[PDB]
Structure formats: structure tokens, C-alpha cells
Amino acid sequence: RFHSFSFYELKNVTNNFDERPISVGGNKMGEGVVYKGYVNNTTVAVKKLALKQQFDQEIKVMAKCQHENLVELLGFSSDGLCLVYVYMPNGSLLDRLSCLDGTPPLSWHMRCKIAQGAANGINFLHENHHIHRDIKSANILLDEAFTAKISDFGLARVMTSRIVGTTAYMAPEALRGEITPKSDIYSFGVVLLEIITGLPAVDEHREPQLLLDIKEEIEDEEKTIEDYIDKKMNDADSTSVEAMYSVASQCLHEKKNKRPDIKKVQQLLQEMT
Ligand SMILES: CN(C)[C@H]1CC[C@H](Nc2ncnc3sc4c(c23)CCC4)CC1
């Protein structure tokens, strides 16, 4: 299954949980807090949790779901809570879309591969009867080849009394307390809009504040998808951009039953390229 690490082992490999960023010679990737570690010539991501149910749920889902587009869990620590993963050198899709820390903008070609990869990851989760509940660009990680890897299965799983997730990405019924794989489809629709536009899902100093509202402006003919295409690309073609927008639009249907299933989303993204 997974390797059982003692807390002392993870303490040393992260250089005593060096809270300084990587750029200043520390071990912090970012925020629990994520630290870069080195174990048996292999680079690892150690998430020190700062909660026990989310630790147990992450281990349970990870043991059942192993896929090319899912982040891989290597081990854990519970003596004296840490989760050890395969390290993703290119961080999150949110960070790469915002060009955080001077990284070059992602090309349209890279963005298409990322969208396909993320859809393949969600498909595997849904085939294994799991609902993510927090699909967003911050939860889509990028490996050494910029392959998309869905992360954070702490909230993975019908009604609930504890509404959890990210408001800007959440489906109307998810905000109402419902738990359905169709809510993950809606959230992926927001991610597709972030990929096309390079804009975050929410920006308080922006008009409109929420990205999913651009779908209304396009449908009401107030604007077009061309007006919203990320200008930080030089290789975007109208056909494939409209094809990705069509998938995003279908995903963002307010009525959950009118949304396509992940298999259809996966099919439409493959046809796009
Ligand atoms: C704000 N940004 C700099 C963030 C900071 C956290 C970072 N997180 C990771 N970075 C590298 N590898 C991994 S594996 C794994 C995670 C992760 C989180 C869950 C499992 C993504 C970028």
C-alpha cells in the first residue's frame, strides 16, 4: 500500500520544516503547508496538516484510485499529521495561468493537453464512484511534463449539513447542500473558462466579479469568447477555442441533469484536438 513514515523522518528530509520559500533556499512550496523533501534520491511533497477525517479520507481514496491524471500518494505520518506525495515541480494550474513567480504563459497547445488530462482524472474518479467536491485550478497540479494531476481528496465522497468547497467554482445545488458528481462537472466548466481566459474564477476588484457570469454576457450577445481569450497566448485558433468554450458552456448549465457526464466532456475535448 503506502509507506509509513515516522514524524522525525519527515522533519529531517524537509530540513526541519524550513518555512522559507524554495527561491530563498528553504523548503516551502506553499500553503496545511506543503514542503519539498528528499527521500531515497526521490523529490517529495510533504503536506503537514494544520482535519483527521480529511487525512483518513485522502488515504482511503488514494488507496482505491491510482491514475496518470491523479496525484500519487507515497506515504503518511500520524505519530505525535503528514501526507507524502510525488512532487509536482510545476505547481498548480492556477499559479501557471497567473504566471506566478515569473513563469512563462502556458501556450494553447499546453492548455489543451492540461484540459484533457484533468478530464481524464475526473473520469477515473467518477468511474470509481467518487465525487471530488472541490474541483478548481488550485487543485490541478502540474508534473515535470506539465501533465495535469487532480489533487486534494480530503473532501471526496444525497444531502449534507456541512456545505464545503470553493464558492466561485461551486454548482448552485452544491451551495444548497447537495452531493452529486454533476457538481464536479459544473466546477470543471469554471476551470475550462480559467484556461481559455487566463482569469481567476473570482476577482473582487473586477466587473463581473465571478468568471461564470461571462457565459451570460456571451449568450446575451454583449460580448464574444474572442473578447475573453487570454491575450498571453500566440497559438490559439478560433475553432479549438470555440470547441473548448462549447464544452465549458455545456458544463455550466444551471440545471444539473442538462450538464454532460464526464465521459461526454472527455469525448468533446479529444475531438477538439
Ligand atoms: C500557492 N502555490 C505556490 C501552491 C502551493 C502548494 C502546491 N502544492 C503542491 N506542490 C507540489 N507537489 C504537490 S503534491 C500535492 C500538493 C503539491 C498538494 C496536495 C498534494 C501547489 C502550488
Domain range annotation of the chain: 1-87, 88-273
Contact 81, 58 (CB under 8 A): no
Give dist(CA 246, CA 265) in Å, integer: 10
Question: Which CATH number is 1-87's, of 3.40.50.2000, 3.60.15.10, 3.30.200.20, 1.10.10.10?
Answer: 3.30.200.20
Pocket test for ligand 1, best of 14, 19, 29, 100 (most atoms within 8 A of CB): 29
> Is the peptide bond preceding residue 208 cis, with omega within 30 degrees of 0?
yes
Give dist(CA 61, CA 54) in Å, integer: 10
Q: What are phi and psi of 182, to 5 degrees?
A: -70, -25
Coil, helix or strand at residue 162: coil
Contact 92, 141 (CB under 8 A): yes
In angstroms, what CA-CA distances link 83 with 50, 138, 145, 228, 254? 12, 18, 23, 38, 36
**How many secondary structure helices (H) and strands (E) does the chain include?**
10, 8
Q: Does residue 244 have a known ligand-binding role?
A: no
Active-site residues, by number, are: 134
Q: What angle do CA 187, 188, 194 make, to 5 degrees?
A: 95
Q: How was this structure determined?
A: X-ray
Give dist(CA 208, CA 196) in Å, integer: 16
Give dist(CA 262, CA 125) in Å, integer: 10
* Residue at 260: amino acid letter: P
Sign for the pseudo-dihedral over CA of 256, 113, 110, 146: positive
Q: In Å, how far from its chain's centre is CA 205?
A: 24
Closest residue (by CA) to atom 3 of ligand 1?
Answer: 30
Contact 99, 105 (CB under 8 A): yes
Sign for the pseudo-dihedral over CA of 197, 101, 14, 42: positive
Torsion of CA 49, 36, 139, 181, to 10 degrees: -60
Angle between helices 108-127 and 238-251 (to 10 degrees): 30
Pocket test for ligand 1, best of 33, 92, 152 (most atoms within 8 A of CB): 92
Q: Does residue 246 have a known ligand-binding role?
A: no
What does the block give as the cell for 227?
473578447
Give dist(CA 186, CA 183) in Å, integer: 5
Q: Which class is domain 88-273?
A: mainly alpha
Give dist(CA 108, CA 124) in Å, integer: 25
Name the one residue in this structure whose C-alpha cell is 471530488: 132
Contact 126, 98 (CB under 8 A): no
